[PDB]
Design a protein around this ligand. Structure first.
Ligand SMILES: Nc1nc2c(ncn2[C@@H]2O[C@H](COP(=O)(O)OP(=O)(O)NP(=O)(O)O)[C@@H](O)[C@H]2O)c(=O)[nH]1
Length: 142
């Protein structure tokens, strides 16, 4: 039961940051979601066919570019290849230089069939939740 999770997105959004947090390259760690264990391997790929159990697409809420690159990715993913996709708006802490609102993320995931969450790698906020929902989401689509 080793779920393989791919970390995708535009440059500088905070991918390597999210991987590192979650697993103290490729990142290993087992977690408990709903009474049930779970062994995630997280691939910070921008640091192989495509053998992914889930995709996390990260954008920064301070970078509209990264955000619209994310939709573009989401559509690509869907045309090419099923596997669950999680849409992540990282950097929720930079309240000031924010370019994408929460609602824009949610009301764009829902329509393009992603799980949405905002994280802040800098404040270890929702990084836990993110990788928990990744596990849950792989289970929702057996
Ligand atoms: N304030 C804040 N800064 C963040 C957050 N996450 C990442 N950063 C910062 O943004 C920069 C890019 O982080 P990084 O994780 O390297 O992004 P990346 O997506 O891996 N870049 P690359 O694709 O080049 O590997 C770093 O300076 C990092 O500290 C966050 O949640 N909040």
């Amino acid at each position: 039961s080793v779920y393989k999770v791919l970390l995708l997105g535009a440059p500088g959004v905070g991918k390597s940051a999210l991987a590192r947090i979650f697993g103290g390259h490729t990142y290993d760690r087992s977690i408990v979601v709903d009474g049930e264990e779970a062994s995630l391997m997280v691939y910070d790929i921008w640091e192989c066919m495509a053998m992914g159990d889930a995709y996390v697409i990260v954008y920064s809420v301070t970078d509209k570019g990264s955000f619209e690159k994310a939709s573009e990715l989401r559509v690509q993913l869907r045309r090419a290849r099923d596997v669950p996709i999680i849409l992540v708006g990282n950097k929720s802490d930079l309240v000031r230089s924010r370019e994408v609102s929460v609602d824009e993320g949610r009301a764009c995931a829902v329509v393009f069939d992603c799980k949405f969450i905002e994280t802040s790698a800098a404040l270890h906020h929702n990084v836990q939740a993110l990788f928990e929902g990744v596990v849950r989401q792989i289970r929702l689509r057996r």
